[PDB]
Amino acid sequence: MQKHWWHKATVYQIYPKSFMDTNGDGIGDLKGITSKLDYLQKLGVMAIWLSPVYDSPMDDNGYDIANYEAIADIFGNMADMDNLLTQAKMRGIKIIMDLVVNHTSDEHAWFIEAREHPDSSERDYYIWCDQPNDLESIFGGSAWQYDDKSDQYYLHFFSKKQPDLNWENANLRQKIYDMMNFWIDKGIGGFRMDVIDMIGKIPAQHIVSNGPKLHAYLKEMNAASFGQHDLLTVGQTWGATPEIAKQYSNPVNHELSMVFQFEHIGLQHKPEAPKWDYVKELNVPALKTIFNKWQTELELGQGWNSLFWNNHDLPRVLSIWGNTGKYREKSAKALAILLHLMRGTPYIYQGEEIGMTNYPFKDLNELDDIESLNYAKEAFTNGKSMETIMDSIRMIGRDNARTPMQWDASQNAGFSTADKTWLPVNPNYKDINVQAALKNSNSIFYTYQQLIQLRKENDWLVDADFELLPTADKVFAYLRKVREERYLIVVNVSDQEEVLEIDVDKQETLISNTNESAALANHKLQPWDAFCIKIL
Ligand SMILES: OC[C@H]1O[C@H](OC[C@H]2O[C@H](OC[C@H]3O[C@H](O)[C@H](O)[C@@H](O)[C@@H]3O)[C@H](O)[C@@H](O)[C@@H]2O)[C@H](O)[C@@H](O)[C@@H]1O
Ligand SMILES: [Ca+2]
Ligand SMILES: [Ca+2]
Ligand SMILES: [Ca+2]
């Protein structure tokens, strides 16, 4: 397999509005990000997946873009963007921009022209109809919004302020490629593609994800822009299966580097039910089966996996599948070890490296995400009390991943000097913060740092196969094998002691959050024990 710079890379996702505020408006900005590049360099990440910082009304906080080639006032300006690029590069960190082209803001110049002048070319940049079908919006309601100005419905799988682009229009696709090349020319390291598996949509036929022309568009996009370069492109694909992922990531297809698959995240809610009907108790056996399948199916020179626990749209891993009490740190380390030692490119969400958690939202007013507010509005009139609604939101609400990054124990956790922050800082910041984590030699931060270094200095993390071992339900163990080197990863994913009925000859310990020797010798695992040892 041809190796690229990103094959040894670990990506760090930054949610711009909640990373670092440098001008006291209570909202993170580009200068704030740039001011923390030394930190990220210490962590050792090679790239930053930067969520949207483009001009936007912020109806969906950046994913509703009004201008693909201008920075939103709140984040700063193009000069700030350029400096981030240059300062990051100087520290060996590439910037991966968030590519949101399945839709734009209804305040984008193209849509304004499409609505005001139905005969214009840009009218066809969007999807209109006289007779709407039953397609629904992901944020609630019909996916069709009637426009009384032109007397037609426009499609929007997301919010009403995010009209869908018409990917059947070759001229629209071209303008998207011109825009992508605008960014490529500035020296970015790649693109994270927002719900990219939706561009093959055919609404008339109720075809949304995995449309028939989907891969053809990606091949066309590749050839017209990033293909000739050596960038990292990761597509967000909810409708992806291992076979489809191969189509995406096998380099011979000339499409993407990898994609984000959400099969494991699916274990967070009852099957066939909205994410709001969550499941607290992680089904470890199911997880083993899912991870094992993706590690097995996407073999070398056949596909490449992306590895992640959470992002800006998901609950922080500790709150959903980890321990937020007595074993916060240990569980956090255990989950990090379990994921990063598999084959693929791991993604760390800001704050994950210090073990931040979800926020205890008390009422609707304290929220910001349109998705949560829409769900609440609808649930309230359908048999759900406000408390029940707030309980679901405290667990699954997207705002849980958007509270300010916790840097220290000062005001606003060192995130801002403002009276208040756009989203409230978690009270646990007094205990959970970057300064304290950097001070404690055995904090969660260093575990991530060590995992990152191992991946940067060892070919086996890339070349070794994956084999799931037969163990107790809550024990997640597997080996990575290449030639004659054998690495055993054992992670006790539970708050209880578990049995480890195995016998091996330990050669060396690569990383451990406990006494690996005692666990091996006693054939028992203390809660959240996690380690990787090279064995004979
Ligand atoms: O730009 C809009 C939105 O796009 C990305 O996230 C998409 C979306 O992903 C999840 O929902 C997808 C999932 O929703 C239901 O389950 C449907 O039934 C499925 O078909 C569909 O795959 C997530 O739950 C949403 O919150 C999220 O909006 C960006 O990452 C988002 O930030 C952005 O808002
Ligand atoms: Ca600011
Ligand atoms: Ca009218
Ligand atoms: Ca102040």
UniProtKB/TrEMBL annotation:
An individual GO BP term: oligosaccharide catabolic process
Keywords noted in UniProt: Glycosidase, Hydrolase
Keyword Hydrolase set for record: yes
Domain Glycosyl hydrolase family 13 catalytic: 13-402
Keyword Flavoprotein on entry: no
InterPro entries membership: GH, GH13_cat_dom, Glyco_hydro_b, O16G_dom_2
Gene Ontology molecular-function annotations: alpha-amylase activity; glucan 1,6-alpha-glucosidase activity
One Pfam family in the UniProt entry: Alpha-amylase
SMART domains per record: Aamy
Family label: Belongs to the glycosyl hydrolase 13 family.
Known role: The physiological substrates may be short isomaltosaccharides.
Protein name per its UniProtKB record: Glucan 1,6-alpha-glucosidase
Species this protein is from: Streptococcus mutans
